[PDB]
Scaffold this active site. Sequence first.
Site, mmCIF file in Angstrom:
data_model
loop_
_atom_site.group_PDB
_atom_site.id
_atom_site.type_symbol
_atom_site.label_atom_id
_atom_site.label_comp_id
_atom_site.label_asym_id
_atom_site.label_seq_id
_atom_site.Cartn_x
_atom_site.Cartn_y
_atom_site.Cartn_z
ATOM 1 N N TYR A 159 43.776 4.566 -9.040
ATOM 2 C CA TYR A 159 42.741 3.798 -9.717
ATOM 3 C C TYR A 159 41.733 3.428 -9.019
ATOM 4 O O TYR A 159 41.799 3.212 -7.522
ATOM 5 C CB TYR A 159 43.594 2.603 -10.331
ATOM 6 C CG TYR A 159 44.447 1.780 -9.277
ATOM 7 C CD1 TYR A 159 43.542 0.956 -8.527
ATOM 8 C CD2 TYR A 159 45.713 1.778 -9.196
ATOM 9 C CE1 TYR A 159 44.279 -0.035 -7.843
ATOM 10 C CE2 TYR A 159 46.381 1.044 -8.413
ATOM 11 C CZ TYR A 159 45.695 0.194 -7.783
ATOM 12 O OH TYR A 159 46.416 -0.824 -6.968
ATOM 13 N N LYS A 160 40.624 2.796 -9.485
ATOM 14 C CA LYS A 160 39.595 2.348 -8.965
ATOM 15 C C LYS A 160 39.814 0.741 -9.177
ATOM 16 O O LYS A 160 39.904 0.352 -10.386
ATOM 17 C CB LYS A 160 38.248 2.867 -9.317
ATOM 18 C CG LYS A 160 38.107 4.222 -9.038
ATOM 19 C CD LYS A 160 36.601 4.456 -9.034
ATOM 20 C CE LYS A 160 36.161 6.071 -8.795
ATOM 21 N NZ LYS A 160 35.214 6.593 -9.701
ATOM 22 N N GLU A 161 39.347 -0.139 -8.341
ATOM 23 C CA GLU A 161 39.462 -1.407 -8.285
ATOM 24 C C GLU A 161 38.127 -1.867 -8.013
ATOM 25 O O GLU A 161 37.279 -1.356 -6.929
ATOM 26 C CB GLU A 161 40.510 -2.011 -7.710
ATOM 27 C CG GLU A 161 40.534 -2.043 -6.265
ATOM 28 C CD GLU A 161 41.660 -2.825 -5.631
ATOM 29 O OE1 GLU A 161 42.755 -2.984 -6.187
ATOM 30 O OE2 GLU A 161 41.687 -2.999 -4.400
ATOM 31 N N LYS A 194 40.094 -15.297 -5.258
ATOM 32 C CA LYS A 194 39.449 -13.861 -5.367
ATOM 33 C C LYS A 194 40.140 -13.344 -6.581
ATOM 34 O O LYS A 194 41.246 -13.300 -7.151
ATOM 35 C CB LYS A 194 40.412 -12.966 -4.157
ATOM 36 C CG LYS A 194 39.588 -11.875 -3.704
ATOM 37 C CD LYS A 194 40.174 -11.095 -2.556
ATOM 38 C CE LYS A 194 39.762 -9.689 -2.299
ATOM 39 N NZ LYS A 194 40.056 -9.180 -0.907
ATOM 40 N N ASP A 225 43.553 -8.934 -11.133
ATOM 41 C CA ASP A 225 44.381 -9.702 -10.506
ATOM 42 C C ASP A 225 43.548 -10.995 -9.974
ATOM 43 O O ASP A 225 42.355 -10.901 -9.494
ATOM 44 C CB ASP A 225 44.871 -8.733 -9.132
ATOM 45 C CG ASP A 225 45.794 -7.883 -9.639
ATOM 46 O OD1 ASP A 225 46.601 -8.039 -10.486
ATOM 47 O OD2 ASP A 225 46.270 -7.089 -8.555
#
EC number: 3.5.99.14
Length: 160
Positions: free
Chosen positions: A73-75, A87, A106
């Site tokens: 995945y990309k975050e 954060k 998150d």
Amino acid sequence: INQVSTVTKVIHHELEVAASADDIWTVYSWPGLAKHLPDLLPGAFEKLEIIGDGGVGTILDMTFVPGEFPHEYKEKFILVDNEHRLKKVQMIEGGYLDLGVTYYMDTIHVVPTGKDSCVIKSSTEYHVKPEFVKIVEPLITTGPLAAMADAISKLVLEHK
């Protein structure tokens, strides 16, 4: 076209740490962290590609070794708030977005509890289409939040 209705889920994890919130936040907000994630989480990654300087707006394309779900995945680092030690990291492509989830975020909040102690308050919020709820429920756990908190806590506390 209206995008389908979804159900919201929020899971939470806390870790008490015998170090100051400033010490713990130093690691969570270090711009060098992204590129050193394979040191922090040994053997977790097949591939890691970073676009950005490690601060807010940086995108990480994470590919994991086989036998992990998700595989890739990309975050993106959405918020790196120094005043609140807050954060936010969003899954923006792949991973659970390919399993009926339309939003995955998150949040980590490092909260002081005493002169040299804090608590790392980590959570995942996801929005899932209702027929995928039973399928994704066992897959999205506090595991990855704990792994990060445990690794950071130990990096700060232990003495090799």
